Write a protein that binds this ligand. Sequence first.
Ligand code: SJ4
Ligand code: SJ4
Ligand code: MG
Ligand code: MG
Ligand code: MG
Ligand code: MG
Ligand code: MG
Ligand code: MG
Lengths: 5, 5, 236, 236
Amino acid sequence: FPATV
Amino acid sequence: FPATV
Amino acid sequence: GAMGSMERASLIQKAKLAEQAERYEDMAAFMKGAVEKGEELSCEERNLLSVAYKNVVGGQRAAWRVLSSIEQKSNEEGSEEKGPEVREYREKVETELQGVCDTVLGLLDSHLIKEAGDAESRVFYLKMKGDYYRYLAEVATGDDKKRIIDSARSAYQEAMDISKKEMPPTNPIRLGLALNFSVFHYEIANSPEEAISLAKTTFDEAMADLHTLSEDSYKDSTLIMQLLRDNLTLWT
Amino acid sequence: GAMGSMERASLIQKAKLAEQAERYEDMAAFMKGAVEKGEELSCEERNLLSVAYKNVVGGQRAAWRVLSSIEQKSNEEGSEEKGPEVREYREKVETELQGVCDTVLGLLDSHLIKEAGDAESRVFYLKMKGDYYRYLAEVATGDDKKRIIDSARSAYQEAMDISKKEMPPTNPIRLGLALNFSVFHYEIANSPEEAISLAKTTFDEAMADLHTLSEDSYKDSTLIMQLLRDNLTLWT
Ligand SMILES: COC[C@H]1CC[C@H]2[C@@H](C)[C@@H](O)[C@H](O[C@H]3O[C@@H]4COC(C)(C)O[C@H]4[C@H](O)[C@H]3O)C3=C(C(C)C)C[C@H](O)[C@]3(C)C[C@H]12
Ligand SMILES: COC[C@H]1CC[C@H]2[C@@H](C)[C@@H](O)[C@H](O[C@H]3O[C@@H]4COC(C)(C)O[C@H]4[C@H](O)[C@H]3O)C3=C(C(C)C)C[C@H](O)[C@]3(C)C[C@H]12
Ligand SMILES: [Mg+2]
Ligand SMILES: [Mg+2]
Ligand SMILES: [Mg+2]
Ligand SMILES: [Mg+2]
Ligand SMILES: [Mg+2]
Ligand SMILES: [Mg+2]
């Protein structure tokens, strides 16, 4: 999965 | 801490 | 509410203890109690709120993905029928996840967003609103997947408009909003070109603004920039 | 009980799903429901029960240790008074931990232990009884720390007596019981010499019995033997 903050 | 199972 | 009898300062203190103990459900409950005291949150308190719920729903999402994968395989050609249990348990986790998202969205709507006038707080809360509609969208299928997606988009867009007017390109909240809206485009909205364009433009404009910063401001910022680059490398 | 309407087989199936999803609280609730159906547990089901509660209480214990450490520092010379919150929150986690231990001990007493006739099941359940009294002892201070410690010792001792009569020295349940009883001696009972003696004798007698085993039986066994050796190296 792609990175989120 | 020591190991327990 | 079960936190109604506890002092606001004690709730904040205990949220920080819960964080140290990695008790994020407790952390989230303390911070909900603090929000419900009705006073605005400071910068540090907003971070406690976000960290708590991001970790709670993050675990739910990870579990949901495990179960959904098992469920999808159970529905492939040649798979033995094993009854309703996988669906039931996936539904159980999903309903719990939806409940947490609804709780966060309710705090934002009652009344964090309406009282947030400074760009930092308003963008922060609208980013959260986009984030929790995005999590609802990840599990949505029925007659409101589209309305849920548009709710996420609307919140992210309003946050973007404010962040571009009121914040420097290297502001960590502006950067994290762009990171997550770019992921929304790629993973939710079926708009990989928009996702890539947003991540690239954000990275490039942040690079050109780094010279204005102190060594410490050159930190979670360059940190979030690396996440933009990481995503771009995954996507291209 | 909230699991009273669910089939036993469905509870076991969902415990395995919960394990895969690392949802150990759910796993423990499913397995409590299964135990409360009143039938004996198979070997695999006993492992599900143990894994679920070991992970739940393991997280509680880790959090309790974090909070107790903060609390102890708050009570050192020169520490600023910050009010009752650290104690309160440590107490909250402690009470939750005690509740889980009491739940497990109740399942063992109603009626897993009394119906367990085979050495494997009886030793397994008595080891768990020792384990959960040991966890209660870790947080005990008042007029029953000593009774709690003796309850742990009594359960471990009965399990030991059976395991030595009925199980080969390399049996993984016998080995794990000895590992944990040795830790009880070192960490709870203030008996480091007994702890070392037990770990060494267990390791040596297991070594001498490895020749009787298949390649796979030479596995979690040599695995638990390494844990005995690890503890001996920590202690000497
Ligand atoms: C609603 O959108 C919140 C997003 C926008 C961007 C980011 C900033 C607020 C960022 O400023 C913030 O950082 C602070 O909070 C962090 C908590 O996590 C640890 C590892 C302890 O580091 C901390 C940092 O040191 C500290 O600056 C935070 C992060 C940094 C590490 C990029 C990730 C955390 O999700 C968050 C609290 C969240 C947010
Ligand atoms: C009440 O006291 C239970 C203790 C006694 C000793 C041990 C044995 C029952 C042991 O036989 C058992 O092992 C099985 O269950 C494991 C679960 O964890 C993983 C990593 C998935 O590996 C599995 C093994 O493959 C499988 O043999 C288990 C362990 C092995 C890895 C040593 C650790 C687990 O606490 C337990 C379920 C527990 C117990
Ligand atoms: Mg007050
Ligand atoms: Mg549903
Ligand atoms: Mg644009
Ligand atoms: Mg039935
Ligand atoms: Mg107490
Ligand atoms: Mg002896």
